[model samples]
Target chain A: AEIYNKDGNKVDLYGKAVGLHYFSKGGENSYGGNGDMTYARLGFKGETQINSDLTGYGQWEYNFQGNNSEGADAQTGNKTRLAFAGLKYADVGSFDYGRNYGVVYDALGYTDMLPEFGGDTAYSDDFFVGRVGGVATYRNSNFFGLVDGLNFAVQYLGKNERDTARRSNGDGVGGSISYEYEGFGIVGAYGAADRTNLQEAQPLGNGKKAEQWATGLKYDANNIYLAANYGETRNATPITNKFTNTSGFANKTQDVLLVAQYQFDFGLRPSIAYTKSKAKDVEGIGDVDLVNYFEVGATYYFNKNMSTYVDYIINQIDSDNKLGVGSDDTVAVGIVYQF
Target chain B: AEIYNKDGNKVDLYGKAVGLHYFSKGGENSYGGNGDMTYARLGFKGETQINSDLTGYGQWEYNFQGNNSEGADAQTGNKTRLAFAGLKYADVGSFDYGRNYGVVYDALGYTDMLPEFGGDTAYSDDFFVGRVGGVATYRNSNFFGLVDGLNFAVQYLGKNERDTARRSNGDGVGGSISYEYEGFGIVGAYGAADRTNLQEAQPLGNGKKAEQWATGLKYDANNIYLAANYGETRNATPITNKFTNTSGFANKTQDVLLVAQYQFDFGLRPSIAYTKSKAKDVEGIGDVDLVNYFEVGATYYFNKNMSTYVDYIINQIDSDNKLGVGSDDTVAVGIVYQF
Candidate 1:
């Protein structure tokens, strides 16, 4: 939707949603099936020209978790995912502030595909690769006289909240670089967290620093696509969530993944992927075995904005670790209709 | 908004937002007030022609509650309210699967006219009526070429999650029938929830199941509308939300509702409603008594896409059952913008 002001400026609204019926063998319990509408989202974005050389843009995104039927949907407030405003200059590039995607994910975009599990090898968990609150970012497409399509970004997250005089736990820095020539693309990124002000808290291996790095390559041509990614994270603080795992740990985790997809002429597309992850030198466990993950899926499109898919994924651990580990499989059939 | 592709396929985006200043007594503590944006929503829908006699359609709806100022709206995620994919055949009916509304509420569409508290007779707390997750539905109109403007639907919901495994209590089945002729409409519906799986748990009256049925009639002429609904629910779970209720009774409930509205040429629409609910055979206590609910509202339309409303609602309980039950009143002034 577009709104035009009396002064002739225009603003547009846009968004998308995805829902699915998920069935799994290694369920929260035994084997089970349920409806998953968690990934649905809505967003509003707009741009206005300030002058011949610069423009101002802003975007806001909210996660829609409405399929939860335990209570009134009205009680579930809107959750902001991204809220950023920025300025773009034709010659000087662009800068933005507020909550937004970190530069690491920007560089690793080549490996960001699939309906659900994208960039899994890049440590794209909540605290690492997604949008960061209270952040400022700068980006340039032609960095240091490099060829076009060579993009670079740097970002810093400030202390948005504090618990004590010495507990500013949200400061971090990250940077990324990516280049694309024809159908071939490559990316590299690094991010670090500093906890110097955290006096009474023991996070990240009881130290005050956490670091991560990733690299990826992709080639797309005709109706086929291929991509590979490798990433490593060290001394990262454990995430504690009530619905999932909460065994806090500090160690190094590594991942490698490969993906390929081919689109046929008759609105059918098939894709396959493999991912391997390993955890090593943990606080309570040592050299945890790797999990070999495999996924296959096919999608049928009746039109540009409407489509359906069936996916099957399996994750098998090589050996048991201090924590219980086993093989888990999931089958999901889903549909997406976007406007 | 609409977008057409090179192949003549089209997609559209639509959404609306409501912001309100709400004040209410019988708060968790004392009387209080706050800003509410819970009724806002965004949706995407599209249809594709597969053959001359067949078509494919899909819809995705998300709740957008972005304006609540009690806390930061950024943390709440976008929620999915409805997600379904289906097909339409000229000679056959329509079938949809995913997450969708129960057939019982669909049949009582006439009484679903109010902006808030529509069909409150059926314990509209959350479950039993309204949207059902992991559901499949079938709908038919002009069945057997018998009549025009007649519609019927059947829906079934599979096992979905709840507070606990034993309380995985969202499974149900429902049916509804409605007919419209000229300016009058009539509807009837039935819905039942399975509590066998929840017997080992304490949800609603020990091992007793929950069942509800409703019927309503509506009349409209010369910009005036009138409707009345009667509903009964047996062995229903008690809602413990502090804002709406604190009855703490596992009992059977019955409700009666009446609604009336008139739209004037001057862009003003005034509506009013009254509901009476009674609880019987309480498990912990004796007959839990009754609550009388009354609401009066008026809306002013700035244009087709923008409107403002003022609503006053009050609930008066008949007795005190160890809980401070008294008269609770709410006043809300809200505005809505649609696209």
Candidate 2:
């Protein structure tokens, strides 16, 4: 949040650090334990009024990976989480450039609310239809006709050319619309991407495009909340050589998610979520029947910027393969501190 | 801007979004238009007074390529621009660790004032003589005596090893001294690097080293600025097999630059710079040649944080070979909005 103004401009500094310890088991004796800290990042955002009716804004966020003990050189990867600059007009809308989320993601956005699980395979975990880089977006709240609580968004992901003999590239276009009245809300989104170049590492350019559509509905009343989402994705089949493929072209996946949460007056919130996804001809496996995950968690807030949570997840997979049916259980306790 | 304070600590967030539009031509019709936004970054800096005479400070910066229009997950490359944490003493100056600029860069730092070009080939654009990702630095504003404006700095770049078979790595150490009296200043710097692994791509590691030295003098009075710098670099030549090659070992390049600028009260500043470089076997042509560049630019400031500029650059290559002489022109216009 902006807490100070310098030279007629508002500047805000923010960040969060999240740490978790995980214990897991699979099948009869498969077990593992480790500590995971991710998305520990720092960010800055500012805005200045360019005119009486317009404002110029910019934001940048980066992940520290919880390794600042070694200073800034401790961790390096895709540390940049967000960077964008744009403008806002009083009663019109806002437009920005740089990294941002996708429309398909905005549609089934409820799935990501869970601390663990709920990023259903058909949505983001495997479909790669969420946040994208090299994109431009236009968004408007109070969209057309000044109807309150109505919003519209459109986005385009530009192609990135690799300067190598094996050029792999991908581009996408998407849009979404959402409306909320009182404690109920609904969202719908669609996205399409040219994945031919995305599969350049393969012998052939997959040749097939990717398409996804999703819808979600949620309601919040008092201290109770509930949400449901459904999504479907179509992807190109895996092949050694796309040019010589004789098999049918595409693979499809469908997913459904349900979540419910109840907040108590004692700073404790309990939540549960279930996701069932079915896939076929994806992951190089054939007739992949179903993958299901269930999670239950409780989070306690100590303050506005400090919290702790405990989560348990059960994962089950069924397919027509030698691996047959398998199940795994994971339990995690995490603490988060933000500034 | 300091937006928040906890206890006695001040937390501030800062960054700039600098977008430039470039039009360039070289040799022939090699010209095009594209969105070229660079150094668009966000950062955070905070300070806490540990004691009456000591303070702790930390900074982190990351770049956000303007193409995020592709989504938040789009571009990922050298996004981590700087990260460092250090302590400052009332009388002893400061000491820091992590990524930082080299001492030699601090010696001749005045050259990089232009929007597009100013970093000579001997320094940053062609050679790695600027910021080092993993480095520790120490500086003292007032060295031995009470000579006003006297300072010194030293830096060390640590070696990073690889686990693979090819264990090629490089490290550097450098130092600089500068003195300023009134509006006149002079600086001298020297740096050396062990190139044991920089030649790893070659079959054999060339056991040669890289060394550089520079000296600069500048005078600033009223709204006028004048500077002149001379620098030299010695680089190991490319070799197919260092163990078997007995012909030659290294190349050397020497460069000189002159700059002049005048600022007017009307928010406009005009500047010009010229650089002349001579190389011996540096271009792999086995002969010495001269590369000259001339640039002129003017900048107009709309406010403290808003500005626009246009620059024109001319480059010429002179050598005795079948390639013949060549020249090119580049023109650029850019806008910078910061908060």
Candidate 3:
């Protein structure tokens, strides 16, 4: 957008695009990337400060979070990553409404100690569960020198045109918060969605309710960082919606992940992670036990816009139930460029 | 429109919106604003002088040039105003493509010319006519000492989604030349269109054609000025195509106009114009003698962007024709603002 002043002079605007890829595996039977790299995207945004104290910013992007086969197409309907517009000030925290990470998910970001690929390991419970058009979040600047920050968030399962509960639109509200202190950090958040009478439905049930929560801790020192997180969801399946009988529904599941890495300042850094996912009961794949993954990788940065990485990945599934198809382990290397 | 340099500073951009309302019947009788005024528009155009002799420019506009009555509604529709981009050279003239005024129409502009709504009386011919889509034109710089301009234009109308005749695409070409010697000036131009196999038995015959020619003369005495112009067109009605016999098909049309005006220091200007359009051998309206109109008005400038005016118009129609309905005369007053 351009506006002219009495004494005209030109000004320009700028924007950014980001992409990441990773090779990994899961339950020796799951339909995963099978160790082949896949692409995910993110965009950065900024605007010329038309004035002091009043800064406008916005970002529009999609996060490619699913890849189940060789050459997994990015065209798969990924409704959103993040889209928001708002103002910012030095003395006050920023306010934005759009697709976003839950308060708990956000506060845990700097301490995750994971590779660019989300979750240091497959089934990492710390990952964010997203809903479109059904949620909002807020954060405060350095609440105290010790806390470093404070945040609050709310989400509605009652899917409507607004809120982050994507695909499904309903009424539900949830939120989370986090805090950071020198050498140690902690974060957690929760969200619940009542998919009651949603316009579109699946046989799982018509009036479904879903909830997710996670907590994490981290340590950074001596050029080395270590982090771990655990998360759980209730009614992971839609079968128990108000319209369906819960006579035989499975119990909720809890997942956990851990990461460790070292920064050598040699233009490259090596890292590794472990992840595990499980539940009390899962249909088709009973006992909620399927895939477990281990991965190690190194990234060689070629300036701020590009990098190359190689990683070795392994997967082990309980013989009782199989959900993926592939060798138990596979490895690959890749490079990415961004502008 | 905006232009910036290597250092990111604005160079040039300009914009304007103008509107007017006035009425007149066949040049024989006078008429006033019995209807909403036409020729309402907004335009933004700018040029970047990349170098000393070369420049680039673009302009887009919204046009309101149709009757507001039941037969035609100008308020809503795809804006068919001036949409064009072109390049100019100080020593070699300029070339442009898109919807724009014909060379003949533009050649007549002068400072002392009648105000937009003034009832021009010296009706020498070309006064009100517009064209659109796929036009190519070139105007020379300083054709001679007093003749500072000369231009040529053409259009190869492409297939249209609507009517095949009246609105069918076709091919046309024309040119105009004008001279500005001190306070004395003159302009003249001619253009025509030809369509082959565009329509059959269609209202307008195949090989339908339209051609126009106009010229203007003006004298400026520092504070006072006088001007007059004439323009005419020939339009064909289709009968048969593909060399098929279209004997019963008839074509009609020939228009003539005269315009004159004088400006005073107090910001008041009186003007008069006469226009007569004859239908020769017309199918339904046999030899409809002419749609003649006469108008007079004054303008009071309220700064560069605002103005007020009042006009009296009269129309003269052949007893056998229904051209200007209500009556042969009417009076109207209106103000206009531009941004």
Indicate which candidate wins on TM-score: 1
lDDT over C-alpha atoms for residue B16 of model 2: 78
For each candidate, the alpha-carbon lDDT, in order, equals: 0.64, 0.63, 0.48
**For candidate 3, what's the RMSD?**
16.0
Taking all chains together, the TM-score of candidate 3 against the true structure is 0.48
Interface RMSD of 1: 4.6
Tell me the lDDT of model 3 at A312. Answer: 63
Per-residue lDDT, model 3, residue B11, is 39
User: Model 1 misses residue B167 by how many Å?
Assistant: 11
| lDDT tens digits, residue span B1-339, model 2 | 666698879987667765454455422321122333433766789999998988999999876664432223335444676789999888778899987666777756766677566765433211235655567888888774466789988877677454421222368777889989888999988877666443543432234576778888988889889988888777622222122432222367677888898889978989899977666553235444344778889997655665668887766543332223234456776656576
* C-alpha lDDT (0 to 100) for residue B36 of candidate 1: 55
lDDT of 3 by residue, A1-339 (tens): 233222222222222233334344453333244443355554334232324653444443434434434364433433334433334555565554443444445534543443444352121111135323213344556652234545444433223321111233334566666666777767777766554343233333222666667787777777777888787766532222222322122346667777887877767878888776665554434454433677677777787667777656656554443432243454556666655
Residue B173 miss distance in model 3 (angstroms): 13
Fraction of true inter-chain Cα contacts (below 8 Å) kept per model? 0.23, 0.20, 0.00
Q: For residues B1-339, what per-residue lDDT tens digits would candidate 1 score against the true structure?
A: 454332434455668877766777544331223445456776777666766866666677766556545466543644566767676677577877766776667645566666554455433223446665667688888773578878887877665655433224456777888888988888888877666444435432544456778787888888989988777766554534233433332457777778899999989988898877667675545455444667788888888899888877765553343234345566777878888
lDDT for model 2, on a 0 to 1 scale? 0.63
